[PDB]
Symmetry: D2
Subunit: 267 residues, 4 copies
Amino acid sequence: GLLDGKRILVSGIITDSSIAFHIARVAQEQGAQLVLTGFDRLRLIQRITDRLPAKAPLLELDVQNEEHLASLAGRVTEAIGAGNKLDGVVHSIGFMPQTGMGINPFFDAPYADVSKGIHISAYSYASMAKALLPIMNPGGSIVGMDFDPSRAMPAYNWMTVAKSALESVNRFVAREAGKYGVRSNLVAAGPIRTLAMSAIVGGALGEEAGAQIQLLEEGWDQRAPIGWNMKDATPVAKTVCALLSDWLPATTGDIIYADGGAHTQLL
Amino acid sequence: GLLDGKRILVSGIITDSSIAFHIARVAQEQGAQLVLTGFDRLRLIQRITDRLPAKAPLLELDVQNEEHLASLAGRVTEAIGAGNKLDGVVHSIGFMPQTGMGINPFFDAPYADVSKGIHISAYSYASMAKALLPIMNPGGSIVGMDFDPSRAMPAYNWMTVAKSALESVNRFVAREAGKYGVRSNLVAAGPIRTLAMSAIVGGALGEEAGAQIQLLEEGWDQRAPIGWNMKDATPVAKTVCALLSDWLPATTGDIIYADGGAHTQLL
Amino acid sequence: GLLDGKRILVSGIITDSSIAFHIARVAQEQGAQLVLTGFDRLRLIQRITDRLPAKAPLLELDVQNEEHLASLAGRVTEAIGAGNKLDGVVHSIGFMPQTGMGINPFFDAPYADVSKGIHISAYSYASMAKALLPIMNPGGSIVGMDFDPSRAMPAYNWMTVAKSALESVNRFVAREAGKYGVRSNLVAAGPIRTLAMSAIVGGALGEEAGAQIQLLEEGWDQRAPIGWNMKDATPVAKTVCALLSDWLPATTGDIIYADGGAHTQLL
Amino acid sequence: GLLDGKRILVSGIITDSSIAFHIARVAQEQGAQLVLTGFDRLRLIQRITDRLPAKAPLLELDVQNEEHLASLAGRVTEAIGAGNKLDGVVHSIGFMPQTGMGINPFFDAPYADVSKGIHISAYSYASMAKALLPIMNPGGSIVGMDFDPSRAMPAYNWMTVAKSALESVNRFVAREAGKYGVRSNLVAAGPIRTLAMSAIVGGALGEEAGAQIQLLEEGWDQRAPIGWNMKDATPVAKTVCALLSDWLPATTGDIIYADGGAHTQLL
Ligand SMILES: NC(=O)c1ccc[n+]([C@@H]2O[C@H](COP(=O)([O-])OP(=O)(O)OC[C@H]3O[C@@H](n4cnc5c(N)ncnc54)[C@H](O)[C@@H]3O)[C@@H](O)[C@H]2O)c1
Ligand SMILES: NC(=O)c1ccc[n+]([C@@H]2O[C@H](COP(=O)([O-])OP(=O)(O)OC[C@H]3O[C@@H](n4cnc5c(N)ncnc54)[C@H](O)[C@@H]3O)[C@@H](O)[C@H]2O)c1
Ligand SMILES: NC(=O)c1ccc[n+]([C@@H]2O[C@H](COP(=O)([O-])OP(=O)(O)OC[C@H]3O[C@@H](n4cnc5c(N)ncnc54)[C@H](O)[C@@H]3O)[C@@H](O)[C@H]2O)c1
Ligand SMILES: NC(=O)c1ccc[n+]([C@@H]2O[C@H](COP(=O)([O-])OP(=O)(O)OC[C@H]3O[C@@H](n4cnc5c(N)ncnc54)[C@H](O)[C@@H]3O)[C@@H](O)[C@H]2O)c1
Ligand SMILES: CCOC(=O)[C@@H]1CCc2nc(C)sc2C1
Ligand SMILES: CCOC(=O)[C@@H]1CCc2nc(C)sc2C1
Ligand SMILES: CCOC(=O)[C@@H]1CCc2nc(C)sc2C1
Ligand SMILES: CCOC(=O)[C@@H]1CCc2nc(C)sc2C1
């Protein structure tokens, strides 16, 4: 398999529609040995991950919790066995309070809410790299999830701002990761119909925001020369596995677009 | 003059080497009527601004203070006279705690420090636009100060991340400002020898950081096809005035580079 | 005026809807003294330019003609008077054979046609700078016209490829122009309803191409935070004059977008 | 292997230091069945390719020859057997006359020379896709070789302009290739010490050009967070194979940077 013998940490599973669930599934189909991390609802996450092709230890990780971050490398080492290190790290963590996304005006998001969103969605990519680089092998790979923020768009609002910050954070993490012989890259995915996104498109954060995101999804598939299927995270999961593999060994501080090529076309 | 009859708010003056001091001077030489805003050291700022070509009211504005932001439009209206509105707004505000810039490792900046830096340097661009758009005239212009964050660089660290967030914020502010017939743009300046930058290059945030920034400054002038004079903020001030004028009326959500053309050249 | 006392060469006038006609008109309203250049239909161009606010000498220039290029500086000097040099140069020249634009498949444009289009639209920007830099003053400015080619789009086909080459050419021209204290920049305009574009939208190069360009124009105005009026070249002309002025003195090898901010927004 | 059972055409082998020689070697180590194409010196190319891990048919292809292009799909079909189609296409073709690269001034490259360089280096990417798309399988992949032309640089001159045109061509080829379920992407490699590049660095195109390219190579490795080894094309070859594989299935019209991450860092 593509990832035979690799030890990979995968964060971000919350439902069976999580992009990280599909990353974990594909990595296991490709021979990777995984360690999973989960936030807050660990009983739910264990029940979800019982459906993965192979059994994997699940560790708690709230990226806003400094104690969780400080003990993370020790907890991972205990799970993978002393003398073993990770070959890969997947950051598939993102959050923005409802005041920072949807119909709520861009100017009406309080800073405490924007700050929480940037902490979870951007700063934590550096927090995770800091915690895990001392237990990573040379030739290793750190991958985060991006949503192309080069241009503004309706409804995504402060989540787009957080993604612009994440892209910048990734370039600095690459400088640090390079000292360990480790790569740091992001996968910029097209929109995916996760449970939260289906709810948002359904109007959970206002009607106009749902209508605008539905138009964005349609335009994405129209612009993509190979099309874009929002109900299928497998092409995104495969791209993350390509970066975790030994097949992109000279790519770092960079962004790989798994978006059907939509960002390369205007119409 | 370029800005004859225009009413322009200028934030960010702290010393006679502040980029905003030169923006204010050039705007006044060009016939603009100014309102200045200052943070914390108002006695110092008044003494500095006494050296400007013309007298201008000075209002206190701490962008982290919600009360200052809530009363700002009323305080500006009182200063410019009832029935008058602003034609221009200059955001020349930036800050990052020393833990987020310099020799302190990128991974060692606590989030509370990064968050303060992003609040002042990025979020406040939206806070200022929210406060002042209701008192701006159609054809108006909002300008912020940028430092090209497209690629990572030594020492600038979390300030670069904050600038990536500011560029994203600017694109959203442009969407809101457009509803008022107002433009929103950033000027990406080359490095300027302000008092803080001279101190940093002198080793105030560690020797290695000072050495790296000095090399960056030299490389900037070398790459610039027209050269780059870090001791001269006047080309930057002129560029801000070009955006405040009626001469770039179809440019918004954008970045104008006043960097000697250095970002367009590799060597 | 913005361009008081400046001597500026303006190429590219063919009809009263030419972007260059509006650049010439605005530059004259702003106190510039012009020299015009025209291709092939000089009687027509003189009759058109008789409608400009002020009289201006008209010189023949076919950019594919090496003799025209070799004698150009001498012909300009004769027109402006010995001892006088140009302060500005406007390249507003573009062409692509019909095989390289429209419904004709992208793969069906013969190279001789693509090559002619790239010669006129991209290489000539360097040919014009080579011919005129020896007769340009320090502080001078060379401006070319761009159409954002960062992403592919229907119908524009090989014209987009030629614009990608022009943007690259501009960065090299800036290196050469800098030796003379001269800036080189492009203005990336939104779509303008010139006579040829109206004919194209009307189906002159096939129905599907006309339909696609009409959709592009509509989407442009929708995405522009300040809107985009394709029937008005004046905001584009003002932007060219801003670059010809002394108000963007630290910008070179660069692109200024006079597109209503449309390129900064996805939807 | 990564490319088990795939039928891949590889162009561009001229010496054992050709990037295409290493692409061909790695693709064969990964189970691909190859068809090679060669220009002008077919006896030399056969002797070179005798050193590849497996035997592969060699077909003549001068991309400037319309007859070679018109018969190419028929010649490939004869070599791979009737009823078989290609899964992959590698364009590793580049050329610029010496007037367009090196110490010869940028303004001194005659258009006939620039045009030949753009024909071979940019237009031929579309000519090759036109010829081979009718004999490509869905899920297929076309890959071309790029050298980051986003910023101008010394000595590369018109080769950089040709690469800017190639990047634009790639985005249009992706639109056409998508109709066949085929991806089109470029690999932007860091500088490689091929025979021609070693000769250029050695002063074959002037001393100053050699000195500048040597400085560019050094700066590349310095900026790369993981370093850059110009004497090793294997990381570039692996990246091309990643794009030829099924592991980047949602990436098209795009650029993957196999440059040690140097383009993501300023210093
Ligand atoms: N869904 C899309 O359209 C889309 C597109 C591009 C990128 N992405 C990105 O992909 C990633 C995965 O998101 P998803 O769409 O699969 O949604 P998701 O809800 O399935 O996953 C987001 C994850 O973030 C985790 N998380 C939130 N706060 C956390 C905290 N304090 N500590 C640790 N984990 C925390 C959640 O538990 C969840 O597992 C995110 O970075 C997201 O921004 C999503
Ligand atoms: N100096 C450079 O090399 C350089 C280069 C590019 C961009 N810039 C940007 O230009 C702008 C001006 O900075 P400068 O270099 O002139 O430095 P400066 O110190 O002269 O100005 C920064 C200003 O930010 C103000 N400020 C800080 N915290 C504030 C708060 N809470 N509320 C309100 N104002 C606050 C300070 O009072 C000061 O006036 C900043 O956005 C900076 O990032 C600087
Ligand atoms: N119209 C648009 O939508 C649009 C948008 C962005 C940029 N532009 C660019 O603006 C510029 C001006 O074009 P326009 O739209 O005003 O069209 P236009 O037809 O009015 O102008 C193009 C000019 O190119 C000249 N030209 C053609 N071949 C020439 C040659 N061999 N030598 C000298 N001159 C030659 C023509 O005579 C004409 O004056 C071009 O570079 C064009 O690509 C146009
Ligand atoms: N060497 C570098 O530093 C570097 C860096 C980035 C990209 N590249 C690109 O990689 C590709 C391969 O070049 P390389 O460096 O391996 O050099 P190379 O000389 O080994 O390969 C270039 C190939 O182009 C072929 N070619 C030239 N004219 C042709 C024609 N008319 N028809 C068909 N083939 C023709 C040559 O025969 C040769 O095989 C090129 O696109 C080049 O621009 C090179
Ligand atoms: C309203 C907040 O939504 C989220 O945070 C969800 C999880 C992260 C996420 N990232 C996106 C690009 S959309 C989204 C949806
Ligand atoms: C150490 C913190 O320094 C600052 O915040 C100063 C003011 C804002 C600023 N912006 C830059 C691009 S350097 C700098 C210097
Ligand atoms: C079919 C060829 O059309 C042209 O060459 C006209 C003049 C130049 C031009 N540039 C554009 C961006 S559209 C266009 C229209
Ligand atoms: C002087 C012309 O050199 C070439 O054409 C060689 C082959 C193609 C090539 N591409 C590069 C990015 S350098 C180079 C070197």
